[PDB]
Amino acid sequence: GPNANPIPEHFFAPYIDMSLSVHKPLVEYAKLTGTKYFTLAFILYSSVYNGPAWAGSIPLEKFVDEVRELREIGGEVIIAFGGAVGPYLCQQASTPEQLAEWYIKVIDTYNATYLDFAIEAGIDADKLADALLIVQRERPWVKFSFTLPSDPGIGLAGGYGIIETMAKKGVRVDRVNPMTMDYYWTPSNAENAIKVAENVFRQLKQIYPEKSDEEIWKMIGLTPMIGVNDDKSVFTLEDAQQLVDWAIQHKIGSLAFWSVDRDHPGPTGEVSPLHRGTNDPDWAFSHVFVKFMEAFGYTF
Ligand SMILES: [Mg+2]
């Protein structure tokens, strides 16, 4: 369309922390990473603006021009809410109507076609669902993704209840995107990411028993944390390659990772927003994950 582009059927849209002072133009990241799709993170409640803002108080509209320029090369974005720290819009809003108004302001500012709810903290899932019923009614072209903590012993944790609530309420669930990271008791590697994927497959089959195997895999995305994780385990470049190959074979809907600005070498094991604590060259993980899209027709 004139102000929005198609996202491929099998896509890779890694997270960019928009609040970092190192932030490059989106078009520059496209050139460097090889992907022209990104998940922009995170919108939170700003007390200063009494509404949505990046990391809870950078002006909402700051990146409109960057998104326009990315769209000029055929790129597109997913706008993400939430993340590790609150206050989330869905926590601060007193009513689902207020919450939907805020989500719609974000959609309208960016002409967004896809939203991501990265729900890590405790929330009122009923209020969220009620808000999203309003959003999908008013903005019926906007897809919803849910990015949620996971563990290779269980699949989704409390986030399972969120998806259950969505499905019951009749809220569209376009993507379920477990965060395959930070288990603490077992390492963040490809084997464990695949176990999470399999568990989530079973979880979604329970909610949507009428869906085919291929329909369920299409709903699933996986998001590792590249290189060193918060628990000192390391999701390696070999893990990336193994996961990409598995993802291609299973024809899953999407991959992402935390994060674009971490895709640089750094001192071994150091946790940073600016590098991944491994020795792989700049953009090495990005280039491996792009192979997922390339299997299914993508070229850039
Ligand atoms: Mg929120």
Side-chain angles (χ1 to χ4, degrees), residues 3-8 11-14 16 18 26-27 36-41 54 63-64 66-71 74-80 106-107 109-116 142-143 175:
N3 299 296
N5 294 311
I7 294 168
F11 68 85
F12 164 55
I16 298 171
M18 298 302 285
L26 297 179
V27 290
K36 57 189 188 179
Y37 315 106
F38 299 104
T39 303
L40 313 188
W54 303 96
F63 304 110
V64 166
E66 285 189 18
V67 172
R68 176 192 319 116
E69 306 275 46
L70 180 63
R71 285 177 172 149
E76 196 41 71
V77 301
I78 302 174
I79 306 297
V106 176
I107 293 164
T109 297
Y110 282 90
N111 188 208
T113 69
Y114 218 136
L115 302 183
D116 182 46
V142 177
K143 292 189 182 177
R175 177 168 177 248

Coordinates of all heavy atoms in Angstrom, one line a residue, residues 3-8 11-14 16 18 26-27 36-41 54 63-64 66-71 74-80 106-107 109-116 142-143 175:
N3 N 1.4 3.6 2.3 CA 2.1 4.0 3.5 C 2.3 2.8 4.4 O 2.5 2.9 5.6 CB 1.4 5.1 4.2 CG 1.4 6.4 3.3 OD1 2.5 6.9 3.0 ND2 0.2 6.8 3.0
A4 N 2.2 1.6 3.8 CA 2.5 0.3 4.6 C 2.8 -0.7 3.6 O 2.2 -0.7 2.5 CB 1.3 -0.1 5.4
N5 N 3.8 -1.6 3.9 CA 4.2 -2.7 3.0 C 3.9 -4.0 3.6 O 3.7 -4.2 4.8 CB 5.7 -2.6 2.8 CG 6.1 -1.3 2.1 OD1 5.6 -1.0 1.0 ND2 7.1 -0.6 2.6
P6 N 3.9 -5.1 2.7 CA 3.6 -6.4 3.2 C 4.8 -7.0 3.9 O 6.0 -6.8 3.6 CB 3.4 -7.2 1.8 CG 4.1 -6.4 0.8 CD 4.0 -5.0 1.2
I7 N 4.5 -7.7 5.0 CA 5.4 -8.5 5.8 C 5.4 -9.9 5.2 O 4.3 -10.5 5.1 CB 5.1 -8.4 7.3 CG1 5.3 -7.0 7.8 CG2 6.1 -9.3 8.1 CD1 4.7 -6.7 9.2
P8 N 6.5 -10.5 4.9 CA 6.4 -11.9 4.4 C 5.7 -12.9 5.3 O 5.7 -12.7 6.5 CB 7.9 -12.3 4.2 CG 8.7 -11.3 4.8 CD 7.9 -10.0 5.0
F11 N 8.6 -14.5 8.4 CA 9.4 -13.2 8.6 C 10.4 -13.3 9.7 O 10.2 -14.1 10.7 CB 8.5 -12.0 8.7 CG 7.6 -11.9 9.9 CD1 8.2 -11.4 11.1 CD2 6.3 -12.3 9.9 CE1 7.4 -11.2 12.3 CE2 5.5 -12.2 11.1 CZ 6.0 -11.7 12.3
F12 N 11.4 -12.4 9.6 CA 12.3 -12.2 10.7 C 12.4 -10.7 11.0 O 12.8 -9.9 10.1 CB 13.7 -12.7 10.2 CG 14.9 -12.2 11.1 CD1 14.9 -12.4 12.5 CD2 15.9 -11.5 10.5 CE1 15.9 -12.0 13.3 CE2 17.0 -11.0 11.3 CZ 17.0 -11.3 12.7
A13 N 11.9 -10.4 12.2 CA 11.8 -8.9 12.6 C 12.3 -8.8 14.0 O 11.6 -8.7 15.0 CB 10.3 -8.6 12.6
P14 N 13.7 -8.7 14.1 CA 14.3 -8.6 15.4 C 14.0 -7.3 16.1 O 13.6 -6.3 15.5 CB 15.8 -8.7 15.0 CG 15.9 -8.0 13.6 CD 14.6 -8.6 13.0
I16 N 14.5 -3.9 18.2 CA 15.3 -2.7 18.3 C 14.9 -1.9 19.5 O 13.7 -1.5 19.6 CB 15.3 -1.8 17.1 CG1 15.8 -2.5 15.8 CG2 16.2 -0.6 17.4 CD1 15.6 -1.6 14.5
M18 N 14.5 1.2 20.9 CA 14.4 2.5 20.3 C 15.0 3.6 21.1 O 15.3 4.7 20.6 CB 13.0 2.9 19.9 CG 12.3 1.9 18.9 SD 13.2 1.7 17.3 CE 12.8 3.3 16.5
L26 N 16.4 3.4 10.9 CA 16.0 2.1 10.5 C 16.5 1.6 9.2 O 16.9 0.4 9.0 CB 14.4 2.0 10.6 CG 13.8 2.3 12.0 CD1 12.3 2.2 11.9 CD2 14.3 1.3 13.0
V27 N 16.6 2.5 8.2 CA 17.1 2.1 6.9 C 18.6 1.6 7.0 O 19.0 0.8 6.2 CB 17.0 3.2 5.8 CG1 15.6 3.4 5.4 CG2 17.6 4.5 6.3
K36 N 14.7 -5.9 6.4 CA 14.0 -4.6 6.4 C 12.8 -4.7 7.2 O 11.9 -3.8 7.1 CB 13.8 -4.2 5.0 CG 13.0 -5.1 4.1 CD 13.0 -4.6 2.7 CE 12.1 -5.4 1.8 NZ 12.1 -4.8 0.4
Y37 N 12.6 -5.7 8.1 CA 11.5 -5.7 9.1 C 12.1 -5.7 10.5 O 13.0 -6.5 10.8 CB 10.7 -7.0 8.9 CG 10.4 -7.2 7.4 CD1 11.1 -8.2 6.7 CD2 9.5 -6.4 6.7 CE1 10.9 -8.3 5.3 CE2 9.3 -6.5 5.4 CZ 10.0 -7.5 4.7 OH 9.8 -7.6 3.3
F38 N 11.5 -4.9 11.3 CA 11.9 -4.8 12.7 C 10.8 -4.7 13.7 O 9.7 -4.2 13.3 CB 12.8 -3.5 12.9 CG 14.0 -3.5 12.1 CD1 14.2 -2.7 10.9 CD2 15.1 -4.4 12.4 CE1 15.3 -2.8 10.1 CE2 16.3 -4.4 11.6 CZ 16.4 -3.6 10.5
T39 N 11.0 -5.2 14.9 CA 10.0 -5.0 16.0 C 10.6 -3.8 16.8 O 11.6 -3.9 17.4 CB 9.8 -6.2 16.9 OG1 9.4 -7.3 16.0 CG2 8.7 -5.9 17.9
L40 N 9.8 -2.7 16.8 CA 10.3 -1.5 17.6 C 9.8 -1.5 19.0 O 8.6 -1.6 19.3 CB 9.7 -0.2 16.9 CG 9.8 -0.1 15.4 CD1 9.4 1.3 14.9 CD2 11.2 -0.4 14.9
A41 N 10.8 -1.5 19.9 CA 10.6 -1.7 21.4 C 11.0 -0.5 22.3 O 12.0 0.1 22.0 CB 11.2 -3.0 21.8
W54 N 8.0 5.9 24.1 CA 9.1 5.0 24.1 C 9.7 4.9 25.5 O 9.9 5.9 26.2 CB 10.1 5.2 23.0 CG 9.4 5.3 21.7 CD1 8.9 6.4 21.0 CD2 9.0 4.1 20.9 NE1 8.3 6.0 19.9 CE2 8.4 4.6 19.7 CE3 9.2 2.7 21.0 CZ2 7.8 3.8 18.7 CZ3 8.7 1.9 20.0 CH2 8.0 2.4 18.9
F63 N 9.9 8.6 15.9 CA 10.5 7.7 14.9 C 9.6 7.6 13.6 O 9.9 6.7 12.8 CB 10.8 6.4 15.5 CG 11.7 6.5 16.7 CD1 11.3 6.2 18.0 CD2 13.0 6.9 16.5 CE1 12.1 6.4 19.0 CE2 13.9 7.0 17.6 CZ 13.4 6.8 18.8
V64 N 8.6 8.5 13.5 CA 7.7 8.4 12.3 C 8.5 8.6 11.0 O 8.2 7.8 10.1 CB 6.6 9.5 12.5 CG1 5.8 9.7 11.1 CG2 5.6 9.1 13.5
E66 N 11.6 7.9 10.4 CA 12.5 6.7 10.2 C 11.7 5.6 9.6 O 12.1 4.8 8.8 CB 13.1 6.3 11.5 CG 14.3 7.1 12.0 CD 15.1 6.5 13.1 OE1 14.9 5.3 13.3 OE2 15.8 7.2 13.8
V67 N 10.4 5.4 10.1 CA 9.5 4.4 9.6 C 9.1 4.7 8.1 O 9.1 3.8 7.2 CB 8.3 4.1 10.5 CG1 7.3 3.2 9.9 CG2 8.8 3.6 11.9
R68 N 8.8 6.0 7.8 CA 8.6 6.4 6.4 C 9.7 6.0 5.5 O 9.5 5.5 4.4 CB 8.3 7.9 6.3 CG 8.1 8.4 4.9 CD 8.0 9.9 4.8 NE 7.3 10.5 5.9 CZ 7.8 11.3 6.9 NH1 9.1 11.6 6.8 NH2 7.0 11.7 7.8
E69 N 11.0 6.3 5.9 CA 12.1 6.0 5.1 C 12.4 4.5 5.0 O 12.8 4.1 3.9 CB 13.4 6.7 5.7 CG 13.2 8.2 5.9 CD 13.5 9.1 4.7 OE1 13.0 8.8 3.6 OE2 14.2 10.2 4.8
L70 N 12.1 3.8 6.0 CA 12.2 2.3 5.9 C 11.2 1.8 4.9 O 11.4 0.9 4.1 CB 12.0 1.6 7.2 CG 12.0 0.1 7.3 CD1 13.4 -0.4 6.9 CD2 11.6 -0.4 8.7
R71 N 10.0 2.4 4.9 CA 8.9 1.9 4.0 C 9.3 2.2 2.5 O 8.8 1.6 1.6 CB 7.6 2.6 4.3 CG 7.0 1.9 5.6 CD 5.7 2.6 6.0 NE 5.1 1.8 7.1 CZ 4.4 2.3 8.1 NH1 4.1 3.6 8.2 NH2 3.8 1.4 9.0
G74 N 10.7 -0.7 1.0 CA 9.8 -1.8 1.1 C 9.8 -2.5 2.5 O 9.1 -3.5 2.7
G75 N 10.4 -1.8 3.5 CA 10.4 -2.4 4.8 C 9.1 -2.1 5.6 O 8.2 -1.4 5.1
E76 N 9.0 -2.7 6.7 CA 7.8 -2.6 7.6 C 8.2 -2.9 9.0 O 9.2 -3.5 9.3 CB 6.7 -3.5 7.0 CG 5.3 -3.2 7.5 CD 5.0 -1.7 7.6 OE1 4.9 -1.0 6.5 OE2 4.9 -1.1 8.7
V77 N 7.3 -2.5 9.9 CA 7.6 -2.7 11.4 C 6.4 -3.3 12.1 O 5.3 -3.3 11.7 CB 7.9 -1.3 12.0 CG1 9.2 -0.7 11.4 CG2 6.7 -0.3 12.1
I78 N 6.8 -3.9 13.3 CA 5.8 -4.3 14.3 C 6.1 -3.4 15.5 O 7.3 -3.2 15.8 CB 6.1 -5.8 14.7 CG1 5.9 -6.7 13.4 CG2 5.1 -6.2 15.8 CD1 6.3 -8.2 13.7
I79 N 5.1 -2.8 16.1 CA 5.3 -1.9 17.2 C 5.0 -2.7 18.5 O 3.9 -3.3 18.7 CB 4.4 -0.7 17.2 CG1 4.5 0.1 15.9 CG2 4.6 0.2 18.5 CD1 5.9 0.7 15.7
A80 N 6.0 -2.8 19.4 CA 5.9 -3.6 20.6 C 5.7 -2.7 21.9 O 6.2 -1.6 22.0 CB 7.2 -4.5 20.8
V106 N -1.2 4.8 19.0 CA 0.0 4.3 18.5 C -0.1 3.8 17.1 O 0.7 4.1 16.2 CB 0.6 3.2 19.5 CG1 1.8 2.6 18.9 CG2 0.9 3.8 20.9
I107 N -1.2 3.0 16.9 CA -1.5 2.5 15.5 C -1.6 3.7 14.5 O -1.0 3.6 13.5 CB -2.8 1.7 15.5 CG1 -2.7 0.4 16.3 CG2 -3.3 1.4 14.0 CD1 -4.0 -0.3 16.6
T109 N -0.5 6.8 14.8 CA 0.7 7.6 14.6 C 1.7 7.0 13.6 O 2.3 7.7 12.8 CB 1.4 7.8 16.0 OG1 0.5 8.6 16.8 CG2 2.7 8.6 15.9
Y110 N 1.7 5.7 13.6 CA 2.7 4.9 12.8 C 2.1 4.2 11.5 O 2.8 3.6 10.8 CB 3.5 3.9 13.6 CG 4.6 4.6 14.4 CD1 4.3 5.1 15.7 CD2 5.8 4.8 13.8 CE1 5.3 5.8 16.4 CE2 6.8 5.6 14.5 CZ 6.5 6.0 15.8 OH 7.5 6.7 16.5
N111 N 0.7 4.4 11.4 CA 0.0 3.6 10.4 C 0.4 2.1 10.6 O 0.7 1.4 9.6 CB 0.3 4.1 8.9 CG -0.6 3.4 7.9 OD1 -0.2 3.2 6.7 ND2 -1.8 3.0 8.3
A112 N 0.4 1.7 11.8 CA 0.9 0.3 12.2 C -0.1 -0.7 11.6 O -1.3 -0.5 11.5 CB 1.1 0.1 13.7
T113 N 0.5 -1.8 11.2 CA -0.3 -3.0 10.7 C -0.1 -4.2 11.6 O -0.7 -5.3 11.3 CB 0.1 -3.3 9.2 OG1 1.4 -3.9 9.1 CG2 -0.1 -2.1 8.3
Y114 N 0.7 -4.1 12.6 CA 1.1 -5.2 13.5 C 1.5 -4.7 14.8 O 2.4 -3.8 14.9 CB 2.2 -6.0 12.8 CG 2.1 -7.5 13.0 CD1 2.4 -8.4 11.9 CD2 1.7 -8.1 14.2 CE1 2.3 -9.8 12.0 CE2 1.6 -9.5 14.3 CZ 1.9 -10.3 13.2 OH 1.8 -11.7 13.3
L115 N 0.9 -5.2 15.9 CA 1.3 -4.8 17.3 C 1.8 -6.1 18.0 O 1.4 -7.2 17.7 CB 0.2 -4.2 18.0 CG -0.5 -3.0 17.4 CD1 -1.6 -2.5 18.4 CD2 0.5 -1.9 17.1
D116 N 2.8 -5.9 18.9 CA 3.4 -6.9 19.7 C 3.2 -6.6 21.2 O 3.6 -5.5 21.6 CB 4.9 -7.1 19.3 CG 5.5 -8.2 20.1 OD1 5.0 -9.3 20.1 OD2 6.7 -8.0 20.6
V142 N -5.2 -4.6 11.6 CA -4.0 -4.7 12.5 C -3.9 -6.0 13.2 O -4.8 -6.5 13.8 CB -4.1 -3.6 13.6 CG1 -2.9 -3.7 14.5 CG2 -4.0 -2.2 12.9
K143 N -2.7 -6.7 12.9 CA -2.5 -8.0 13.5 C -1.9 -7.9 14.9 O -1.3 -6.9 15.3 CB -1.5 -8.8 12.6 CG -2.1 -9.2 11.3 CD -1.2 -10.1 10.5 CE -1.7 -10.4 9.1 NZ -0.8 -11.3 8.4
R175 N 0.0 -14.2 16.2 CA 1.4 -14.7 16.5 C 1.5 -14.9 18.0 O 1.1 -14.1 18.8 CB 2.4 -13.7 16.0 CG 3.8 -14.0 16.3 CD 4.6 -12.9 15.5 NE 6.1 -12.9 15.6 CZ 6.8 -11.9 16.2 NH1 6.1 -10.9 16.7 NH2 8.1 -12.0 16.2

